[PDB]
Amino acid sequence: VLRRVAFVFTAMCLFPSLFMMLRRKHIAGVARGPAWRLMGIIFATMFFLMFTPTKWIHHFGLFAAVGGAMAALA
Amino acid sequence: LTQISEDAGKLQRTGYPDPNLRPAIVGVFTDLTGPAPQGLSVSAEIDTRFTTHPTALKLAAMLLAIVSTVIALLALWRLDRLDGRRMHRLIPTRWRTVTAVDGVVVGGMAIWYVIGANSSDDGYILQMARTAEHAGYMANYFRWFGSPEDPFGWYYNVLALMTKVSDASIWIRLPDLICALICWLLLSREVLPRLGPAVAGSRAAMWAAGLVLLGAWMPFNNGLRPEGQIATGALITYVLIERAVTSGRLTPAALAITTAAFTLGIQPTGLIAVAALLAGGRPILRIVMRRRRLVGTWPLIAPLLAAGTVILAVVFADQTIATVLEATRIRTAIGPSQEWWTENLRYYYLILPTTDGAISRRVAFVFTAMCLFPSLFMMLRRKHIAGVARGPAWRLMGIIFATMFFLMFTPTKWIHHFGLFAAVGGAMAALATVLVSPTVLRSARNRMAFLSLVLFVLAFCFASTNGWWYVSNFGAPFNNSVPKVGGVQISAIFFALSAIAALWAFWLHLTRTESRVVDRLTAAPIPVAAGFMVVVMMA
Amino acid sequence: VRIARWVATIAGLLGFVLSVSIPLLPVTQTTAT
Amino acid sequence: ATQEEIIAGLAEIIEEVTGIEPSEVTPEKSFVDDLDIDSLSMVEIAVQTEDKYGVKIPDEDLAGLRTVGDVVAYIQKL
Amino acid sequence: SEIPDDAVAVRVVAEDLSLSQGDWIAVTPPRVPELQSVQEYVGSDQPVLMDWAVGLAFPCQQPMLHANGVTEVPKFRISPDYYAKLQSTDTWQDGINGGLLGITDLLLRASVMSTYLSQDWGQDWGSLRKFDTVVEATPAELDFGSQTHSGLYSPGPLRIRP
Ligand SMILES: CC(C)=CCC/C(C)=C\CC/C(C)=C/CC/C(C)=C\CC/C(C)=C\CC/C(C)=C\CC/C(C)=C/CC/C(C)=C\CC/C(C)=C\CC/C(C)=C/COP(=O)(O)O[C@@H]1O[C@H](CO)[C@@H](O)[C@@H]1O
């Protein structure tokens, strides 16, 4: 041992939801915690991990699940 | 004649109908000699579509549009000067201090301007600027069929009229020194005291701002690739939107509109300007709503739309919209598509025309990921931090986070070229080194963990080779291999220092927070990290 | 007072329509055969 | 103007624009002799006092009056 | 500078102590060349086709400039080093995707001629190819006529693909 539909739509639903949860600071509808956990996962698997490091780019559509719940939260 | 072996109508006329097979005219070559016979002619109208110049009507409309938006911004400046605030005392008392950091930044951007490393495609932009006086249309010289770099490219005309004087490497490269001294003179005088009293009262904050400006400027913006001018564009539109936010006026906001419009035009990677424009959308709108009572809406937003579309008067100065569409599809067909730049940033470290991938990803993991994320987390976690003023800081954070999902890997497929936010990432790093300062982070654990992160990301930055592009690495300390000192690599010893700091943080997690050795070691880790990177590049 | 307010609107959006009409304007192409 | 309401509001705007917690703000502390503001950051708070209070501040008294008695003594003189 | 000043005679000495098929050498009698710098040989009047990687290191040689649809015919092809030329430069310009090399290899013969970086022998600065035409010819007369005015029409789609 020793990219136009799959990410940009997910960004266009991601950017409003973060600002809405930031400004309102608690929502009547959605529960508080695992919303922010789904934020944490999507917002961490978008960049520092897969964009800053650059570990084998362009496996485009791998937000099949969490992007779905993000569009639902949108 | 006719055909012998069907008649196929009533003539010998034959050929394909597809208008994608045409000759590549190089000349009209023959091998028969003598006087020319009658009835012999070969004629071809060459496709001089882009080589135009505007008529009297278009030139008159261009001049009327320019002078009309200058009149309407002067009328706007007379309109919003109705709160009786006069612009006395030019170059204010905030500016007339000279700090010791200017001897590191002005006298460090001149030694790097003379001896430093040019960018990858500096020859490309110099070569397509030296020939555009005789061609007359700013031709993308090399690749795309003689089609122009004019869907935007006004800036190369400045280099085109700048090659009238001698075109050595020290004189055509001067717009990346003047735009390196109106970045810093706007980074230490107009955006750090705007960012609060802590970032200006400290000296380590302005030091890490200067050193991160230097360390993010020196690999990328020093060439002829106009990414330094996008840095100065984003910084000018940010301070020109913030001045308008403070004093309540609107003509700095309209000048910020036209500057973000202009420095959208320099490069298609100039969307950091419109991101900086969009991030101040609510304060501009509330300024319009404040002045919406005394003066009506229609004389208020008409100079905004006037000074928003005058970028089209410099972009479309000598290119028709049909000509520009035929110039932009051409790159779209035969050009590198977004799936072509992805497997061309790792493979052999080949020189690519508008990209740096060794240094870009290695410049942008550190200097906007060890000073972007901790300052972001300490910003949105602690809702009321003592020194830092919220709103001028969140707008700059929005510029950085908007341009990471607006330009990079959406609309254009350039890989990370870190030279965009070399200016505004300096102020970003100043925010970071006042957000891990001992006056805001009481925990020695949470400081020592960040010092472990700093040492780890500095180890990752030293992981690859020490390799410059074409003739900048004619002679280097470590040209081919990883930089190693004392047999073992410097990457491994900074990994070991990261391990030592991480263990010292995990050991201080359980004891918990004295202030004897930790306060002297993690006081301002950003300027010492960025200064080590600057001095190793300079050395 | 109201003069500068008038000058901000007219020849402001005249500047807008002229600055948007610049691409759709005549140009004198130089053809070569 | 109940000498505490106005003061609290002006500290809420100092915190919003200057970014200083409502602790240093006393009459004993001021713009340039004790606290740290600047000539162009103080026009932001000047225009915010003109916003929430109908008090058209002259351009010479703004630079003239040095302390934080400037902001109180002018909203209580309509 | 390796051989001393009293050294008078040289003799090339070779060996092929590797018996596989891909291990062979060839020689040529030694020569002391007549070395001229590039700026002395290539002036500022003979138009060269600079490759895009090397434009800033060569800031004085006049590149081949195109005037209303035709170019000058180049005489040299100053290029970057071998790996960046083979994998990064001539794949950025050829007649497949626009390119400048599509109007040089169709018309001119390129032959590499020997260069050495001065005082740093052992580094590939690049390569300097000397074009020569296949048949002797003259630049065309090219009578041009202006004032084909336009609104927003294109005359027809450009040739981009077969
Ligand atoms: C309420 C109110 C009115 C205002 C208040 C709101 C406030 C405060 C702010 C909101 C904003 C605002 C105010 C607006 C008011 C004003 C307003 C109404 C709008 C203003 C908006 C702003 C801020 C700027 C406006 C910008 C405008 C109007 C024009 C900009 C110039 C351009 C780009 C025009 C586009 C031209 C057209 C029609 C098509 C061009 C196509 C295009 C742009 C991109 C496609 C072409 C491509 C893909 C090129 C890429 O090709 P490549 O493969 O990358 O090639 C590389 O190039 C290098 C070569 O060296 C190498 O790397 C490669 O070869």
Integer Cα distance of B394 and B401 in angstroms = 10
* CA–CA min distance D12, chain B (Å): 12
| Residue identifier of the C-alpha nearest atom 33 of ligand 1 | B152
Q: Please report, for residues B539, C33, D35, the alpha-carbon distance to residue B27 in angstroms, rounded to integers and kept in the order given.
A: 53, 12, 79
Exp. method: cryo-EM
C18 within 8 A of B64, measured Cβ to Cβ = yes
Q: Which amino acid is at B401?
A: F
Does D38 qualify as catalytic in the annotation?
yes
Measured from the Cβ of residue A15, the count of other Cβ atoms closer than 10 Å reads 15
Answer yes or no: is the C-beta of B415 below 6 A from any ligand 1 atom: no
Write phi, then psi, for B218 (nearest 5 degrees).
-65, -30
Residue of A nearest to B413 (CA): A3
d(CA B283, CA B242): 9
Can you list the pairs that B198-203 forms with residues at least 24 positions away whose Cβ atoms lie under 8 Å?
Answer: B198/B386, B198/B387, B198/B388, B198/B434, B198/B437, B198/B439, B198/B440, B198/D19, B199/B387, B199/B388, B199/B427, B199/B430, B199/B431, B199/B434, B200/D36, B201/B387, B201/D36, B202/B434, B202/B437, B203/B99, B203/B101
Distance from the alpha carbon of residue B264 to the mean position of ligand 1, in angstroms: 6
B180 near B378, Cβ under 8 Å?
Answer: no
Q: Which chain C residue's Cα is nearest to B42?
A: C33
CA B260 from chain centre, in angstroms, equals 12
User: What is the largest distance, in Å, between two alpha-carbon atoms of chain D?
Assistant: 29
| Residue E14: half-sphere exposure toward Cβ, Cα within 13 Å | 11
C-alpha span between A49 and A55 (Å, rounded): 8
Enclosing H/E stretch for A66? helix A66-73
Rg (CA), chain A: 14
- The pair of structure tokens assigned to C5 is 């307010």
Q: Contact at 8 Å (CB) between B118 and B223? A: yes
The counts of H helices and E strands in chain A are 3, 0
Residue B525: closest CA among B442, B436, B439, B394: B436
DSSP string, E79-96: B--HHHHHHHTTTTSSTT
Residue B151 CA: nearest ligand 1 atom is 40
Choose one of B238, B264, B266, B282 to mutate for the ligand 1 pocket test, by most ligand atoms within 8 angstroms of C-beta: B264
Inter-chain touch E158–B123, beta carbons under 8 Å: no
List of chain B residues whose C-beta atoms are within 8 Å of the C-beta of residue D13: none
* B contacts of A13 (beta carbons < 8 Å): none
Query: Could you give the CA distance from residue B419 to residue B426 in angstroms, rounded to a whole number?
Result: 12
Question: Could you tell me which residues of chain C have a Cβ less than 8 Å from any Cβ in chain E?
Answer: 23-24, 26-33
Rounded to the nearest angstrom, the minimum Cα separation between C21 and chain E is 11
Q: Which residues contact B341 (CB under 8 A, 6 or more apart)?
A: B352, B355, B413, B414, B415
Burial of B50 (0-12, 13-18, 19+ CB in 10 A): buried
Q: Is residue E70 classed as helix, strand or coil in its secondary structure? A: strand
Backbone angles phi, psi at B295, to 5 degrees: -120, 140
- Alpha carbon separation from E89 to B107, D15, D38, E52, E62 (Å, rounded): 36, 57, 54, 7, 20
Query: In three state form, how does the secondary structure of B123-177 look?
Result: HHHHHHHHCHHHHCCCECCCCCCCCECCCCCCCHHHHHCCCCCCCCCCCCCHHHC
Contact by Cβ (8 Å): B169, E59: yes
CB within 8 Å: C30 and E145: yes
* Residue E107 and residue E81 in contact, taking contact as beta carbons nearer than 8 Å: no
What's the rounded Cα separation, in Å, for the pair B391 and B195?
A: 9
Q: Which helix (H) or strand (E) holds E147?
A: strand E144-150
CA–CA gap between residue B132 and residue B125 (Å, rounded): 11
State the residue for tokens 């010893």.
B493
- Mode of pairing for the β-strands spanning E108-113 and E70-71: unpaired
Q: Identity (one letter) of the amino acid at B90?
A: L
C-alpha span between B178 and D16 (Å, rounded): 35
Between CA B367 and CA B98 the distance in angstroms is: 26
Q: How far apart are alpha carbons B215 and B425 in whole angstroms?
A: 10
In sequence order, the β-bridge partners of residue A64 are none
Look up residue A3 and give its two tokens.
């990219």
How far apart, in Å, are the Cα atoms of E108 and each of B200, E85, E101? Answer: 63, 19, 10
Q: How far is the CA of E67 from the centre of ligand 1 (A)?
A: 30
